[PDB]
Design a protein around this ligand. Structure first.
Ligand SMILES: Nc1ncnc2c1ncn2[C@@H]1O[C@H](COP(=O)(O)OP(=O)(O)O)[C@@H](O)[C@H]1O
Ligand SMILES: [K+]
Ligand SMILES: [Mg+2]
Ligand SMILES: [Mg+2]
Lengths: 471, 28
């Protein structure tokens, strides 16, 4: 698999028993207590040596992965973000203020507020947006059957009793739009690629729940990428559009038995699982048609896992309790409901819903499941730890992160599309543009970075070579 | 359930106060 992608996750943040605290201050402590160099364009905003961004957004600490090229790397650097958040909070506890800061990789307080886990995908600019919209809406409406993180409470305000597949569904209100904080659209239309806008669209997806499960994050990014390849190539000839897709989004979420039927415009009546099976079958045909059996292993793995998950969801979803967040969480919830005869309104069930996402290794419920061997993993912890400080090798995040590690004292600022150097003696800053996501890689600049012992030597060697190393 | 005993061991104290106090600013 090769598609430039990334995940931005806003974390919930709680500072109990500190009347002097506010969410912006606590988010700043988290970002600042971890780190490094500033963001290039007054909130705390840091670029890390793994190429990630750590910053305060809307009174939430937010982690954005480096650009990666495949869904396994998306999982890996996204999981490293969880470790960075947990460590950041632990370091903030040693600041003079002494705050115990709790962080949650979820999307709602169950009281009407929501915050986002966004996926970004690089696409051909030429692909017509009307096709992007009409083929993605039904996919996004239904992919929560394996992407959902689970939620106790129905309706944005949480007043309805019961369990649902996703946290985000109740907050989406329209099909298409610019918004990210209110009246949220199934398809967000912002197109800000931080790359050659003549070549690339950046698809900014906002509808997904943050996932703890690595299998869920892998499927979320990997299946979406496969659907994007079909959309770009004009491969989908059928009409998957449904009547009232916003209503369908909510109704699919609110039926964890997975029997609710969408009403397709072409007359078909299909469950969300059934409609997902139609996308999967087209993806299989697409890959066979394009590559034969010359398919890369990861594409094959995504297709196989997508199919197995849908087959098991249709048979008995509880056999997925080691793979999907909403199933793993529901298994705990129903266990307590059976053991202690609890209605869905019980406060203990609300606590399980939230604490599932706590980043602490010793207290977060997903993390306890992993500790007891009750969750399947995709990557191992040693690789996650390495990904906290090393960038991916095959995107421009390589140059960004390695510059920060090796020449941090001489980096004035950095962003997705530039690194800005502050060289000794020069009374002027050197801005090195990194405009192509698939340049600035180890194959392009690794040897050069190895040889240079100073940022001055590096900027000298890069001078006039922008259209070699970076564009 | 062995696992429910593990979850019981780690759940936040004052569960009702904890849930009531978990109030977040809207994000994206
Ligand atoms: N050209 C691109 N194509 C696809 N994904 C990208 C591209 N550039 C950056 N990304 C990813 O998008 C995310 C940007 O995060 P952030 O700066 O928080 O976005 P926003 O401006 O939407 O808040 C990162 O995870 C990054 O890896
Ligand atoms: K975003
Ligand atoms: Mg962001
Ligand atoms: Mg944000």
């Amino acid at each position: 698999m090769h598609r430039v992608m990334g995940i931005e996750t806003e974390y919930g943040i709680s500072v109990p028993h500190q009347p002097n605290a506010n969410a912006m201050a606590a988010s700043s402590q988290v970002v600042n207590a971890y780190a490094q160099a500033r963001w290039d364009f007054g909130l705390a905003n840091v670029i890390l040596t793994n190429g990630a961004r750590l910053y305060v957004d809307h009174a939430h600490p937010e982690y954005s992965t480096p650009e990666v090229t495949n869904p396994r790397d998306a999982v890996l650097w996204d999981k490293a973000g969880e470790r960075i958040m947990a460590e950041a909070a632990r370091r903030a506890a040693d600041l003079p203020m002494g705050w115990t800061i709790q962080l949650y990789k979820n999307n709602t307080d169950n009281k009407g507020a929501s915050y986002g886990c966004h996926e970004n995908y690089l696409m051909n600019r030429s692909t017509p947006f009307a096709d992007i919209v009409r083929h993605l809406i039904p996919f996004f409406v239904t992919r929560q059957v394996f992407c959902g993180a689970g939620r106790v409470g129905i309706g944005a305000d949480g007043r309805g009793e019961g369990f649902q597949l996703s946290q985000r569904a109740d907050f989406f209100e329209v099909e298409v739009g610019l918004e990210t904080t209110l009246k949220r659209p199934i398809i967000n239309t912002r197109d800000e690629p931080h790359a050659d806008p003549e070549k690339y669209r950046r698809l900014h997806v906002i509808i997904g729940d943050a996932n703890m499960s690595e299998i869920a994050t892998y499927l979320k990014l990997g299946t979406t990428a496969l659907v994007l390849a079909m959309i770009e190539d004009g491969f989908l000839s059928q009409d998957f559009s449904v009547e009232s897709p916003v209503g369908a989004l909510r109704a699919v979420s609110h039926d964890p038995t997975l029997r609710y039927q969408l009403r397709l415009h072409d007359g078909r009546r299909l469950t969300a699982v059934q409609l997902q099976m139609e996308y999967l079958e087209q993806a299989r045909k697409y890959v066979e048609d394009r590559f034969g059996t010359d398919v890369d292993d990861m594409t094959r793995d995504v297709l196989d896992r997508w199919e197995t998950t849908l087959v098991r969801l249709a048979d008995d979803p509880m056999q997925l309790s080691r793979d999907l967040d909403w199933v793993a969480k529901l298994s705990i919830l129903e266990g307590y409901r059976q053991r202690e005869n609890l209605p869905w309104s019980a406060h203990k069930l609300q606590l399980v819903d939230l604490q599932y996402h706590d980043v602490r290794p010793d207290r977060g419920l997903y993390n306890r499941l992993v500790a007891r061997g009750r969750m399947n993993l995709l990557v191992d912890e040693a690789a996650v730890r390495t990904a906290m400080h090393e960038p991916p090798n095959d995107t421009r995040a390589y140059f960004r992160g390695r510059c920060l590690a090796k020449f941090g004292a001489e980096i004035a600022a950095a962003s997705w599309d530039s690194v800005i150097f502050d060289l000794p003696g020069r009374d002027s800053l050197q801005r090195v543009p990194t405009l192509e996501p698939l340049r600035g890689t180890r194959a392009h600049v690794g040897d050069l970075l190895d040889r240079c012992r100073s940022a001055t030597e590096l900027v000298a060697a890069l001078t006039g070579g922008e259209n070699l190393y970076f564009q | 359930d062995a696992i429910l005993d593990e979850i019981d061991d780690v759940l936040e104290e004052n569960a009702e106060e904890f849930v009531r106090s978990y109030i977040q600013k809207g994000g994206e």
